[PDB]
Amino acid sequence: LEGRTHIFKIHARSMSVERDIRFELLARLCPNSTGAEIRSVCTEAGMFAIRARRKIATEKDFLEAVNKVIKSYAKFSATPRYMTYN
Amino acid sequence: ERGYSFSLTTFSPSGKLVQIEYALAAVAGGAPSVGIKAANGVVLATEKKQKSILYDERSVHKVEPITKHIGLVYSGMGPDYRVLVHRARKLAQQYYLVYQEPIPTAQLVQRVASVMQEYTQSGGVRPFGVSLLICGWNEGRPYLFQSDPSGAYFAWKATAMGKNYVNGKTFLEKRYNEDLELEDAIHTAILTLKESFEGQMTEDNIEVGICNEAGFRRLTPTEVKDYLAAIA
Amino acid sequence: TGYDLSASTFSPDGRVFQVEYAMKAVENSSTAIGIRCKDGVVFGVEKLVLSKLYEEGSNKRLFNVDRHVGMAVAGLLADARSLADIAREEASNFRSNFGYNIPLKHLADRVAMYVHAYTLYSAVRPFGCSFMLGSYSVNDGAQLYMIDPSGVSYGYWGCAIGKARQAAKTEIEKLQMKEMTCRDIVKEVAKIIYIVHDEVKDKAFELELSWVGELTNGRHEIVPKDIREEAEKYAKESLK
Amino acid sequence: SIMSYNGGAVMAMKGKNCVAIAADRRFGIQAQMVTTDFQKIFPMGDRLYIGLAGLATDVQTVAQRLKFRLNLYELKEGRQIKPYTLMSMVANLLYEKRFGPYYTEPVIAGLDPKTFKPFICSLDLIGCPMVTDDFVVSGTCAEQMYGMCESLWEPNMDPDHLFETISQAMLNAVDRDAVSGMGVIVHIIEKDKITTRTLKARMD
Amino acid sequence: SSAGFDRHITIFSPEGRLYQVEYAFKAINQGGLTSVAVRGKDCAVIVTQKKVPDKLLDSSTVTHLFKITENIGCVMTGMTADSRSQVQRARYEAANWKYKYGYEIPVDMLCKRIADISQVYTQNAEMRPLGCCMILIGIDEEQGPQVYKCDPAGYYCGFKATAAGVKQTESTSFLEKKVKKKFDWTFEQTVETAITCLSTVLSIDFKPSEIEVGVVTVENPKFRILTEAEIDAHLVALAE
Amino acid sequence: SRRYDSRTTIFSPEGRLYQVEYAMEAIGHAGTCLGILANDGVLLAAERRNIHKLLDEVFFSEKIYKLNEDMACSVAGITSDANVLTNELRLIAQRYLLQYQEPIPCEQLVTALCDIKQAYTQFGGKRPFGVSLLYIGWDKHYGFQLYQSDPSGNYGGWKATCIGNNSAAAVSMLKQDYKEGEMTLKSALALAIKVLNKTMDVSKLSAEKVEIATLTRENGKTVIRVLKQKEVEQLIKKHEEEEAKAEREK
Amino acid sequence: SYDRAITVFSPDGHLFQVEYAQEAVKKGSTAVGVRGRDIVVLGVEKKSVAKLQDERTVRKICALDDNVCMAFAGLTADARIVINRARVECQSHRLTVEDPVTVEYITRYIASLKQRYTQSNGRRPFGISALIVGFDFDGTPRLYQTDPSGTYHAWKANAIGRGAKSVREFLEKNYTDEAIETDDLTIKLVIKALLEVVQSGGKNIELAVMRRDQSLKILNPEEIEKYVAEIEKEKEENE
Amino acid sequence: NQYDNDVTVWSPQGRIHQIEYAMEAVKQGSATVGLKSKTHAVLVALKRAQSELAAHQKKILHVDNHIGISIAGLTADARLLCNFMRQECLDSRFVFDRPLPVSRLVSLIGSKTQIPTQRYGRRPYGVGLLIAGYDDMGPHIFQTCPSANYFDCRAMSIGARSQSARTYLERHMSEFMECNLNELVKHGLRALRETLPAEQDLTTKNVSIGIVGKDLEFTIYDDDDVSPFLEGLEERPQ
Amino acid sequence: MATNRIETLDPALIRPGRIDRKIEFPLPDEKTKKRIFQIHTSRMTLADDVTLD
Amino acid sequence: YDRGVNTFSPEGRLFQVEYAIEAIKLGSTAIGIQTSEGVCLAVEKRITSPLMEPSSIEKIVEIDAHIGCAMSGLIADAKTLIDKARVETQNHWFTYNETMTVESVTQAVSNLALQFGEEDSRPFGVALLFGGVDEKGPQLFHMDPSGTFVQCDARAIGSASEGAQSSLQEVYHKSMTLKEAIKSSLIILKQVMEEKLNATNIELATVQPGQNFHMFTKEELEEVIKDI
């Protein structure tokens, strides 16, 4: 749980965001996720900010990023058959 | 018996029943046979080679009656052959219980084909590796019915099954006609059996049964030895 | 690979690897031997103390199936109990139907068929047991049988089941059977079990001896082992 | 008895080259009639009928069961059914209820499907076949119809004398009977055609 | 040519074969044993040696000749558990024949029923196919003696001079070189040829204590197992 | 005992069912039927898969199975599975007649067979029925009908049908020659002759290799006309003369 | 029988076949449905017909009672089975309690069947998603949807089938209370939503309504044509 | 590890690993200790909790007027064998109108747990029974295992880090046989004070004791009638 | 990278950090088909007696 | 690589039950608090769409007239167990004229929390919070898929249970009151939820020895929320 909060602090410390948002709610929606998926969430939230012309993220950008990465590409997701170490 | 009940028979990616194609190949690797319908009777003939000179020819029988007027041979594996023979035996007697009348050969082939098809669907079991040649003289016109492992069946004027069935079939297309007698049927049958067998064909290497409208009759090695004078 | 999995499959050279692996499962158990005399059968089981681990009287491998038949099991233990319960049930059916004591051949054949029937399929595993069966009757004499994990059941004068198997039968074959009463054979098996299976990996061990024959008047019971204490007074004289 | 619950009489008579089957029309509850158009003779294919007599429940039940098995047989085999085959089928269907018996006495009358050979037979309530050459009867008024057919039958009969003989037999044997009356239907069939006539019976 | 699972269960391969039964045909070969049957004029002879390496092992319970019924004997090869289970199936169905049909079962029908049972172990792919070989002998009215064999594949057959086990390519070669040459068949032509064909295949020339001889004759239609004395008589009877 | 299990029921992770489509691609080979309902009657067409010279033709039937008095069905797929289906279907319709003493309407017959097929698609791992098959028939409520069974259990009424993979172009041809109810029984037969002439690549359509059966409406008979070969021959001659008349436009 | 468990949990906490059998719903035809306050309306889009054949057998909207109505998505055969069992259940409820069958009961039955169907030994889960619209006692219009998981779940307008995200986004910017004021406007609202969905040629637009004191009326596709025509007229009046 | 999937598969070393895995499932319970005198049998367990606010998962449960069991591992299989235990007790209590001796009951437990350890598609029961009882011939302290190889002992201890408990029991097994209830029970919980790290022990919050006596019915105690038993102790060494 | 099927891939390539965008290409509609037929007939002497619909 | 579903682990646990304990975590949160005045309870609905009619989502369902409940994660596996638990409580009051206590209810449920198998299928996927007022005062009870049933004084479950348990142990003690615990729960709720806390998000369920039945209609929730 707290690992993903800290990895959000890692990928978020040097990027243009709105610091008034939280990060714990973002971590609570990523139960089985890797740091790579976290990185994709951060970058894709930035890419949704590039759809408009802004200089700061919104919470809704990160929610778009979560439902863009996790729930959509969770059909591939790389770890339902490596957690069993096949 | 355990709770599995799952069919091991699966279609291919293309759509093909690989275990039935393999069962047809296992039929094709068996002993050859030929059977000919010729206006008054039907002749069946097999090719029964002992492996050594030690074996006896009075124990195992290829030509086998199902009722008093219905003969039946195969081209495949005897161990499955006897099982489905026994099934056909038990099945014909229920018809004769119900209707008090000897079963027609088409009705036999319907029910046996239903059994074999229903068994290849059934779970955890392999198909039979047996192709039949069923015949009989029901209601004047005699018949001849070939089945296969896939459950299907046909109706032939003359056919063959086993090794070199293609060569025997190309001999049958040229040789047979519409009208013959039983003796000429035996003549062309031993000719096409002599097409593929070894050189020494005696009263025991072949085994021949006929059908009359007066009933089924299974010929003896006596008349088989009588026949191969001026052979084929 | 692939051919060691099921108990139904054969090998490219024609044997069942499940049955072999189950045979060498019993190979790690303790050495338990048996031998008959001209009027009885004597059993004996090496039981090992580690330090405490129990009380002088648990899990005794010398079972007692019928009034005149008992087991001398070795191998996986719970499977041996289930097999003993099946054997008690079978002797019960025989006593209930035909009205007399079970002959040891029929008992061994029924048990062998059950063990063999558990080897035929993929739903069940083969047994991990190998056990002994002794008896005595006034019209039958002494009979000693032996059932492997596969189900091969035939008769012996002497046998051995466990780790030390040849080295326990090296001196079974130096005894004889016609000239012995079983009261010598008690201390003979006792002194040899104390001889075999040295102190090296296990430190303390403990002896059990079952005992059937004419001297028990057809009964089967454990020896009064504390009475006459016949092992140890010769076993400590067996070290030189 | 249970056979005398609803009355009933079925007569079949073999002629020279043809066969005639007749039955009564009355339906009712032991002394109370209900209708005059109750069907007891059923068509089973062409030129082959069956008659059913006794308790009406088993009449309609066995008729529908037999029609079930009959259509299954004629669809499993493209030919139409021989009469001995039908007799054996009715015998097996009745004998399946050996201890749960139907109360009926089926009468089969039909021609040969290959030749013009006639055929008659009757069965009992457990499945006992009986082939004869002259006539079979079934129902309450047995002895009346026995007296008529053993009195009036000739071996070689043109269909007109066949019709008049079975007419007089049914009329007189029914008029002596009490619980069975109220009209007669007569089926006179042959190789070429099928004729159905109704007689002027006493409506009492 | 193998596809999928066709090396583990009984299915069809691309070459068309099934591999379980053609592994079962050398499941016989781990027995290390040889069997020879002979049928002559009005007798029939079984011969089979025994392999007892142990002095502690008995001699009575090593018997392979199993008297199935009062006119039917048999011998077994292959693994022992399959053999004995096959024997109890044979005994049970012969007794069922005697109950249902009244008269004594002919040796043909017994082989047919056993072959069909073996087919049921073969036909379904979720039971192991019993890797043992079965030899039958018997007397029939109006036909004299018979000798039949039942295989694990389920093909019964039966013939004049019959042999299966370990070394029987050579045994059937010698029996082609011996029964095709017009020999007559006495009680001692059959017995002498039975002991000597195995005595030339194995080349041992041994004691009367290794082979077992089961005979049946139309003077005594009971199945009969010979004693060491008359075995010794035949053995010195072939000593020119 | 589970590593041998073939899993012919669990969805595939592409998104569809797996074994179902391969049963469909098993439908696609060995078979080519259609019928033309466009008033007073309905017909069926069929191709001989075993047109070899050494058969008997003694069955007085072929691909058609007169399953009742007023319904038949054309088969395509593996034959003997369909025999299992025709036996069960015939018995279903006959038990309905046993239950009501009124003939069986064609859609509850179709849905009964569709529930049987879906019953083996849904649960167990059993092999699905690789048979699609047609339906012609009559009722009290709509007249002449046509239905298309599928191995999934899905069905669907048509006015011009199709099973086999050779006959998708036939559906294209049926649309390009679509009529609004014009089956004088010579127009529809000539159209069917034209379709089977074009779609099968058998040059000039030998009449032994084809099969046509019709179903007309009679008051007390409801005859099913499994017609003989001579009218097929003169139908082929009629159509080849009309193709010669049609190519005078070039 | 078939002693096996088809649907196993995932290593990360899923049911593969429940979440994955939603994809079969996701690749089926689209169907919307709203409730007005007095007239209920629903209909399916994308019949994707051959335009030249029968259409009385491909009807995707049926009824279980004279009070309740259907719709579904996914594959049609599982819908056929579930509808047969639902008809049996609603009529058996009428056997007992003498009311007309409440819609909430039949949705609980369908979802309960679906869940005990996914739970059981080796039964493949139902890849459908139904819509159950009815107006029980005292005229209250309600509408529920199903799911392969088996969660009856009351909505106010529909979003299933192909591209349901787009359709719900149009219903999102079209949640006007004004739209459910005029029954005709509610019908036109379904037509406009389905027009903001697929081709909507006025051919695959199969719609059926119920005015809650009658039975279901399937509309003849000339009235729907005039509905689309007046929708296009209002769209021209927007400029 | 293609032999490590099922119960049916023998290993090529003969060790069927489903039983070993069930053993390791027993090893992950709480610590517990059972030990007998000549006249009294005492089993003592240790409770644990999921969090601070929640209560502690109880271990000692009742079976019969003279039989009580300890437990370690899973709780569903625990209650399953528990229900079977009460049922088999009250069956003979019904039929023979006598109390059951413990040894035949534990033989029935082994015969019960054999079948899910041999067929295919059943698990071995993860269970950690320590059984104390009274037949006519005095106290018995049995333990089970998922391999159904039940033992009779004089003192066992199963659960997490239970081996130090066995070391304490060895250097006092001579002293155990003579003493009365009080110092016996406090020897059992001195086994428990060495099954723990040296700074949190048994402050009336985690221990339970079940005594059966020749006149005493089997009775469980928890923290409050254990507060009399917890005094009479000294500290741990340096 | 471009594939036909994706389910037969080893998912270790398909994790993010390697590949971030996964894009579906469906069979489009019956509207952009008009653009496809239009552009693939944009450079030809189309006889106007045909309809692309 | 598909093994048998009734396989333990190399480490010891199982597999499928552990995967069920993982499958809890995606569900919505819930918070129940035992107080001697009575048991209070709270939950989040997780409203997704405005088309989604809000009063139809059930989280607190009713077992008895005095035994409450709340579910999590999968809804419908919970619905089966709720129905059956009701049936067995009705059997107890019938054959005993008395109230089946909450511990006996949960023993009856976790008797078949794991009867999953191929003969005589999967493990269930729901965490449950059980309350009510028996003779032993108020009771709050928590089970799991593994049947490992324990009493909890104030347990928080599901997706936000880490900070819920932590910040709950911050505020909780033994002598709390009712309304203080209610607002103490919903403060934690609107720290752990994602949407704005309003009239439609959450729902309460309180059962008391005085307030005899669990009764909680709408718009006293409004009065409770405007008290923040």
Residue numbers in the entry:
A (entry chain A): 348 to 433
B (entry chain H): 3 to 234
C (entry chain M), E (entry chain G): 5 to 244
D (entry chain P): 2 to 205
F (entry chain I): 2 to 251
G (entry chain J): 2 to 240
H (entry chain L): 4 to 241
I (entry chain B): 329 to 381
Provide the authors' original text about this structure.
A set of ubiquitylation pathways conjugate ubiquitin moieties on target proteins, which are then recognized and degraded by the 2.5-MDa 26S proteasome holoenzyme. The proteasome is composed of a 28-subunit barrel-shaped core particle (CP) and two 19-subunit regulatory particles (RP)5–8 capped at both sides of the CP. Substrate entry into this chamber for degradation is controlled by the axial channel in the center of a heptameric α-ring, also called the CP gate, positioned on each side of the CP. The globular domains of a substrate are mechanically unfolded by a heterohexameric ring-like subcomplex in the base consisting of six distinct subunits, Rpt1−6, which belong to the ATPases-associated-with-diverse-cellular-activities (AAA) family.
Three of these correspond to the previously reported SA, SB, and SC states of RP–CP subcomplex, which were refined to nominal resolutions of 3.6, 7.0, and 5.8 Å, respectively. The structure of the ATP-γ-S-bound RP–CP subcomplex in the SA or SC state was nearly identical to the ATP-bound conformation in the same state13. In both human and yeast proteasomes in the resting state, all six nucleotide-binding sites are occupied. Consistent with these observations, we identified nucleotide densities in all six Rpt subunits in the density map of the SA state of our ATP-γ-S-bound proteasome. All previous studies and the present work suggest that full occupancy of six nucleotide-binding sites stabilizes the resting state, in which the CP gate is closed in both human and yeast proteasome holoenzymes. Binding of six nucleotides in the ATPase ring may lock the topological relationship between the RP and the CP in the SA state, so that it does not permit a continuous movement of the AAA-ATPase module. In the SA state, the pore-1 and pore-2 loops from neighboring subunits were found to pair with each other, constituting the constrictions of the AAA channel. The hydrophobic residues in the pore-1 loops of Rpt4, Rpt5, and Rpt1 are paired with charged residues in the pore-2 loops of Rpt3, Rpt4, and Rpt5, respectively. Interestingly, in the SA map, where the α-ring in contact with the RP was closed, the opposite side of the CP was instead mostly open. Nonetheless, the SA state was still the dominant population (~50%) among the ATP-γ-S-bound human proteasome structure snapshots.
